[PDB]
Amino acid sequence: GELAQSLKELAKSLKELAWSLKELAQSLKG
Amino acid sequence: GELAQSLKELAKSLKELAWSLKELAQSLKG
Amino acid sequence: GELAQSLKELAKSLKELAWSLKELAQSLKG
Amino acid sequence: GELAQSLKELAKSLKELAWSLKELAQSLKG
Amino acid sequence: GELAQSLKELAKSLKELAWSLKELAQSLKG
Amino acid sequence: GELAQSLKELAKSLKELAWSLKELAQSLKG
């Protein structure tokens, strides 16, 4: 269940990453 | 239990990331 | 039950990520 | 031995990712 | 060890992602 | 055994990603 809390954490980070790259994409179209 | 749930969470984040990287790629061809 | 399902879902998200990376790699080539 | 070490290393990489996301979020604000 | 092959896979993908974002960064400075 | 090794691999990739996201953030302030 420690392995699990770390993978929960990674999944939260990757979600924020995906959000950021979406905002980056939006500003690069213009 | 915990782990399966973590892994579902991780999978979801990863499809979100993949989508945003297609959007990033599209904004750069754009 | 829950677990092996989690792993089939992770495995699909990983391929989606791998195809999006391939598209981002290509859009970064001129 | 090997395993718990693996997990302390993952846990540090997750914070580094979280601080880099915070810097990327801020550079994406004007 | 199936969980392990999936995490090996994710680590390979995230490595390529980090590569791409480096090339994206290089082209955005100019 | 396998899992600890996967997790070491994952951690390494994640520090590489964090670095590249600092470089991306820097190129956008740039």
Author numbering:
A (entry chain A), B (entry chain B), C (entry chain C), D (entry chain C), E (entry chain A), F (entry chain B): 1 to 30
Q: What wording appears in the published article?
A:
The two collapsed structures were more complicated. And LL sequences form collapsed structures. However, the cognate structure for each sequence did not always have the lowest score, as apparent from the off-diagonal white and blue points. For these, we propose that the collapsed states are adopted as they lead to more hydrophobic burial and contacts. Inspection of the models for these alternative states exposed steric clashes associated with the β-branched residues; e.g., threading of the CC-Type2-II sequence onto the CC-Type2-LL-Sg structure resulted in irreconcilable clashes between Cδ and Cγ1 atoms of Ile residues at a and d’ sites of neighbouring helices.
CCs are quaternary structures comprising two or more α-helices supercoiled around each other with cyclic (Cn) or dihedral (Dn) symmetry. Here, we describe variants with all combinations of the aliphatic residues, Ile, Leu and Val, at a and d to give four classes of peptide: the ββ class, with a and d = Ile or Val; Lβ, a = Leu and d = Ile or Val; βL, a = Ile or Val and d = Leu; and LL, a = d = Leu. Peptides are named systematically appending the one-letter code for the amino acids at the a and d sites to “CC-Type2-“; e.g., CC-Hept becomes CC-Type2-LI. In summary, solution-phase data and X-ray crystal structures demonstrate conclusively that different classes of Type-2 coiled-coil (CC) peptides—i.e., based on abcdefg repeats with predominantly hydrophobic residues at a, d, e and g—adopt a range of distinct states.
